[PDB]
């Protein structure tokens, strides 16, 4: 209250995470499971393979027969249970998917075989020399070999990608319990903002943050609501916020919250909404005037982020604070971002504060670390790349011995997009 | 023709890329630009900032007045062109977004100022001590400082993410020319396959590849078509393929194309479709029986991939060959995958062939290289992770001196998902 609390980066991060709830669950079709977190253990209802299956192209054979000269009684078809029993001195053609027939207990690949006789040839083999003494069970995948019936194939907490979805198809579990995704409402405040579709007017600029922020969170596959530009006054701020609270889990705003300004939005969170503002300023560059609040409303907790209006500050703070909170909301067990080591492409002058620059990570032939070419000082000095920024260069706060960093020095980088 | 051509991994990759066309263009709303490639240069139609803007909270001042005692004639409002001219001995309140008024040419931050007088106080300042001699132009962002009118802000070939979308909003370019995304049709062939929704029947298994493959390509944000399970016969293969050709750019099938089998599908591509099969087998593990064909139909080129039916082979080959082809199709200038250096978590026995294992990349505190824990030998030996595989461990072909690799040795890894 009054000039709000100044916090450290680390303390702010922990606060966002600790104050953010994990959302409840719902049942979805497995095809909609990308990026979802299982809220249940998934068990197999069948043994895979469900029948003993050949591991190779070759012949289902009796081991006891040994390397003799044999009669080919037929072929085991994929998708068809075999009807014939392999008797002494007989053999059945088999392909690598194929069910082992009732009389054989070994498979001899075709390479340890030679055609002796063919029914003239209208595409048919009648006799083969089996050149090998096979071991009982050889080249056969027994029932339950891959997955046993009742066994847990996916555990609670698994964050699912393509292969997990395919594992669910395999076991025939097509509906599945998972954590909900957060719905995120985005708005921009400022009397100087116009919609990107509008032409400029005196004293006005186009609003870019709303579209950048909506785009950033859509990339993680979370549903969004566009609440538009809200005038910078208590009446319109309150109404905008009330609509986001009723329609969303998270509200993000950006615009005029610095040392001067912070006023109307903090004033409505505090007085009208009775939200609990956890911090209003964070010791960092850029994004010092970042606010984090929570509203406990009807047993439910909504989270609110007031990001700065500066376009680079808004995108940085979204990636440092918002995305991690959303990752926890949708059930991810470790919602922290991946941070990797890279080399600076340039020299940089450290600031007293921890600083974050949008950058591009590039891996060059046979080098251990990628190079981080900083671009996130954008606007008046932009040397355009064909690539998007895929990381945040995390510059350390200046020390007494470390005033600047040199090209080639190993530094930390938050991965913020697909490499 | 007859047993088709055996190719190397590298040769196969180049062939896929070289034979794959770049798709044409279309105009989209900028909000739909995620992952798109600009097909035009984008130029600014306004100077940003469009007015000279304050860089700080403080006062618009006359430099020539120096550090005197001044009368505050008002405040410059964001979104409003100022009406008053700052005269000698006067000053206007200003916030960091705010337009510089017509008489000032310097901004003195509030920290180099002291309140002298306030109109009693109903929230109002009347006089300030300016404690500093400002330089003309100080703390002011001139017109065009960030972007100049007519200047190129985004070039042809730019692969767009959130910040680019926001840059388009900034310049008011809301419709934009970009390369189309490929539409990809997926089908599974095999007489032994059932839909994941079905319960098992004798000799049958559930089809998992279709859902894994559809999921993998949806993750890159490309539109898909599910063509379902097609029986393994020429009539039904032809009809399935004809439908994918009429509705899609790319057709992917998986199922029974090994040394035994390859038959019906290659036979229909060759004889009925007259597609040009570029390769039918590739010297690799897994996925040896991978086929790549192209169809030139009515001036248009369709591409066809016949992936193996083995579930791990299908997902590996999709990431090595399909995704890169789709990346080129949607206009990406360098469609090759990112390959990084990592350490093996285990010992591995090299194979004569180049081998690929799905793995999980993990960065540990303060270490240069991530560790690659191989999991992609899946099915009968799976020690479950909460994380999805996010890379392909690229094991070198066995040599005379290098028979096996040890835990901790630096190896290559294709990044296949978000870190």
């Amino acid at each position: 209250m009054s000039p709000f609390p100044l916090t450290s980066m680390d303390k702010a991060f922990i606060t966002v995470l600790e104050m953010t709830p994990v959302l409840g669950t719902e049942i979805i079709n497995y095809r909609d499971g990308m990026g979802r977190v299982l809220a249940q253990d998934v068990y197999a209802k069948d043994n895979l393979p469900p029948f003993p299956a050949s591991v190779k192209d070759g012949y289902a054979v009796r081991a006891a027969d040994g390397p003799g000269d044999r009669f080919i009684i037929g072929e085991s078809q994929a998708g068809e249970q075999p009807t014939q029993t392999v008797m002494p001195g007989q053999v059945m053609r088999v392909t690598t998917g194929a069910p082992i027939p009732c009389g054989a207990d070994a498979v001899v690949q075709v390479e340890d075989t030679e055609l002796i006789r063919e029914s003239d040839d209208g595409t048919e083999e009648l006799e083969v020399r089996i050149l090998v003494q096979a071991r009982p069970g050889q080249d056969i995948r027994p029932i339950g070999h891959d997955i046993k019936r009742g066994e847990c194939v996916l555990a609670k907490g698994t964050h699912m990608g393509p292969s997990e979805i395919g594992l669910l198809a395999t076991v025939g579990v097509t509906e599945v319990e998972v954590n909900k995704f957060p719905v995120v409402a985005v708005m921009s405040t400022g009397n100087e903002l116009l919609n990107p579709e509008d032409d400029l007017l005196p004293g006005k600029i186009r609003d870019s943050n709303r579209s950048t922020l909506l785009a950033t969170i859509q990339e993680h596959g979370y549903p969004t609501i566009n609440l538009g530009i809200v005038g910078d006054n208590p009446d319109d701020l309150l109404n905008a916020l009330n609509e986001g609270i009723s329609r969303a889990d998270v509200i993000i705003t950006s615009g005029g919250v610095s040392m001067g300004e912070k006023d109307y939005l903090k004033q409505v969170l505090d007085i009208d909404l009775h939200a609990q503002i956890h911090f209003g300023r964070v010791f960092m560059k850029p994004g010092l005037p970042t606010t984090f609040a929570t509203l406990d409303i009807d047993g439910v907790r909504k989270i609110i982020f007031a990001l700065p209006g500066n376009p680079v500050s808004a995108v940085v703070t979204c990636n440092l604070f918002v995305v991690p909170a959303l990752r926890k909301m949708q059930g991810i067990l470790d919602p922290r971002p991946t941070i990797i080591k890279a080399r600076l492409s340039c020299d940089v002058k450290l600031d007293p504060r921890p600083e974050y620059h949008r950058c591009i990570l590039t891996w060059h032939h046979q080098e251990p670390l990628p190079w981080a070419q900083s671009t996130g000082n954008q606007m008046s000095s932009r040397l355009m790349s064909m690539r998007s920024a895929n990381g945040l260069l995390m510059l350390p706060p200046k020390t007494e011995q470390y005033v600047e960093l040199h090209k080639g020095e190993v530094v930390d980088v938050m991965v913020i997009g697909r490499l | 023709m007859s047993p088709f051509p055996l190719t190397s991994m590298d040769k196969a990759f180049i062939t896929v890329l070289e034979m794959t066309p770049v798709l044409g263009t279309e105009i989209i709303n900028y909000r739909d630009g995620m992952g798109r490639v600009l097909a035009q240069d984008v130029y600014a139609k306004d100077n940003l900032p469009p007015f000279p803007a304050s860089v700080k909270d403080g006062y618009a001042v006359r430099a020539a007045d120096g550090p005197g005692d001044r009368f505050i004639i008002g405040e410059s409002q964001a979104g409003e062109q100022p009406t008053q001219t700052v005269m000698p001995g006067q000053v206007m309140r200003v916030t960091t977004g705010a337009p510089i008024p017509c008489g000032a040419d310097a901004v003195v931050q509030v920290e180099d100022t002291e309140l002298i007088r306030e109109s009693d106080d109903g929230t109002e300042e009347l006089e300030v001590r300016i404690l500093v001699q400002a330089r003309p132009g100080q703390d002011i962002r001139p017109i065009g400082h960030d972007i100049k009118r007519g200047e190129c802000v985004l070039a042809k070939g730019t692969h767009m993410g959130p910040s680019e979308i926001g840059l388009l909003a900034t310049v008011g370019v809301t419709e934009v020319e970009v390369n189309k995304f490929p539409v990809v049709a997926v089908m599974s062939t095999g007489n032994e396959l059932l839909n994941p929704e079905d319960d098992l029947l004798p000799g049958k298994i559930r089809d998992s590849n279709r859902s894994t493959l559809l999921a993998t390509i949806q993750e890159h944000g490309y539109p898909t078509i599910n063509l379902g399970i097609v029986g393994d016969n020429p009539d039904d293969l032809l009809n399935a393929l004809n439908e994918g050709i009429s509705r899609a750019d790319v057709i992917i099938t998986s199922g029974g194309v090994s040394m035994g089998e390859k038959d019906y599908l290659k036979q229909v591509l060759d004889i009925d479709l007259h597609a040009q099969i570029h390769f039918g087998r590739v010297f690799m593990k897994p996925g040896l029986p991978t086929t790549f064909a192209t169809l030139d139909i009515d001036g248009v080129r369709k591409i066809i991939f016949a992936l193996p039916g083995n579930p791990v082979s299908a997902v590996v080959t999709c990431n090595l060959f399909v995704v890169p082809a789709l990346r080129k199709m949607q206009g990406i200038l360098d469609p090759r995958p990112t390959i990084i250096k990592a350490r093996l978590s285990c010992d591995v026995k090299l194979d004569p062939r180049p081998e690929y294992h799905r793995c999980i990349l993990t960065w540990h505190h303060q270490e240069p290289l991530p560790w690659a824990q191989s999991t992609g030998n899946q099915m009968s030996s799976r020690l479950m992770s909460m994380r999805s595989a996010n890379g392909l461990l690229m094991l070198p072909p066995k040599t005379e001196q290098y028979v096996e690799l040890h835990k901790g040795e630096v190896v290559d890894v294709m990044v296949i998902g978000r870190l």
Partner: peptide, 13 residues
């Protein structure tokens, strides 16, 4: 774990 960057010196081990 820290979301604040480390110095190249902290990379000594």
């Amino acid at each position: 774990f820290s979301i604040v960057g480390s110095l190249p010196r902290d990379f000594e081990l």
